[PDB]
């Protein structure tokens, strides 16, 4: 996260860290959507251009964290994965279209003050909140700059940007399964996700029932916090049918 700030304890109890067993390293962000289901970006697991293709046994999921590098005894919970489900039509070849993946945990995690699932949007919540100008929140342990690494979870609030502006900012082909966010050069505020934030949640707080909903998944950007450039996120609601499906069976 670029131009963000340290997160408060318990501020994002759904934040998950994807951790590589060997070598022990941070892979990506992710989110807890139920006691046994974690949502993340498909590119965190599978991305051939970088020779990345992780299997369940290559990873661990660390839930309830705040410190990026310390094993937080008595607070965080480390889980093993039973199965990984990558969207069948995820396009790693061109624009990361349908960049979404589900991970089923071997055993359910017990919720606590630091571990609690985020809600997935429904038609009306998505309609009402997903509007240009409305702000969302991104969190992660990714790079603090580039285009170093934080000690604790970072957070930044960013406005949703109009589709036309999103398209005109890049050469990459944008689809309906994505949305972009960030401040326009003339707004005088900055902030963006960056390397390492991939797979993390973009959440919004519903003013109707006061719950937090995950609207997006950190997907890609061209240089962290560049004027006239924006971060792109996987449109969670557009891919909700697939999520229900995978959770319905399995």
């Amino acid at each position: 996260i670029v131009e963000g700030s340290d997160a408060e304890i318990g501020m994002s109890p759904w934040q998950v860290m994807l951790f590589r067993k060997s070598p022990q390293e941070l892979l990506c962000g992710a989110s807890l959507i139920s006691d046994r289901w974690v949502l993340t970006a498909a590119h965190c697991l599978l991305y051939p251009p970088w020779d990345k293709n992780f299997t369940e046994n290559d990873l661990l999921v660390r839930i309830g964290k705040h410190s990026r590098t310390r094993y937080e005894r008595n607070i965080e919970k480390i889980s093993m994965l039973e199965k990984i489900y990558i969207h069948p039509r995820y396009n790693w070849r061109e624009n990361l279209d349908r960049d979404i993946a589900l991970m089923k945990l071997k055993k359910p995690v017990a919720f606590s003050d630091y571990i609690h699932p985020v809600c997935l949007p429904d038609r009306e919540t998505a309609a009402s909140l997903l509007q240009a100008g409305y702000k969302g929140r991104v969190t992660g342990w990714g790079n603090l700059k580039e285009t170093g690494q934080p000690s604790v979870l970072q957070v930044v609030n960013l406005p949703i940007v109009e589709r036309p502006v999103c398209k005109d900012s890049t050469r990459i082909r944008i689809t309906d399964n994505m949305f972009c966010a960030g401040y326009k050069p003339d707004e005088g505020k900055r902030g963006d996700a960056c390397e390492g934030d991939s797979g993390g949640p973009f959440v919004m707080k519903s003013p109707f029932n006061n719950r937090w909903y995950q609207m997006g998944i950190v997907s890609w950007g061209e240089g962290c916090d560049r004027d006239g450039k924006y971060g792109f996120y996987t449109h969670v609601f557009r891919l909700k049918k697939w999520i229900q499906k995978v959770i319905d069976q399995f």
Binding site: L26, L60, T69, Y71, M80
Partner: peptide
């Protein structure tokens, strides 16, 4: 610079 996690998780 990550701290070691207990072997129980590998």
């Amino acid at each position: 610079d990550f701290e070691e996690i207990p072997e129980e998780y590998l």
